[PDB]
Amino acid sequence: LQEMKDIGVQADANAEMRARERRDRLHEALSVNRSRVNQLEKQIAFCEA
Amino acid sequence: LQEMKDIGVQADANAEMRARERRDRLHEALSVNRSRVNQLEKQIAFCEA
Numbered sequence: 125l126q127e128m129k130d131i132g133v134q135a136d137a138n139a140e141m142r143a144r145e146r147r148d149r150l151h152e153a154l155s156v157n158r159s160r161v162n163q164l165e166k167q168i169a170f171c172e173a
Numbered sequence: 174l175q176e177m178k179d180i181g182v183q184a185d186a187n188a189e190m191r192a193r194e195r196r197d198r199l200h201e202a203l204s205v206n207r208s209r210v211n212q213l214e215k216q217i218a219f220c221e222a
Contacts, residue, residue, distance in 0.1 A: 169215075169218070170218075173218050173219060173222055
């Protein structure tokens with residue numbers, strides 16, 4: 125129980141599913157935003173050249 | 174010790190230091206590799222054109 129106080133995380137079953145859903149949708153959104161950025165930078169680099 | 178084998182990690186302090194050092198040298202080398210590839214790609218696209 126002291127180890128639980130040291131890590132300082134509530135980790136409720138409801139909180140766990142909610143946390144993974146938000147961070148997983150965020151991981152895919154980051155990958156999509158970064159892919160758009162890379163695509164637009166390649167197009168812009170081609171336009172410059 | 175069974176829990177330590179269920180999480181599947183050796184967890185030795187001397188190995189922890191050696192592992193982090195080897196990974197950090199590789200992370201630094203990879204960052205340099207990406208940068209080199211980006212400038213040489215610019216050179217390639219420009220010189221070919």
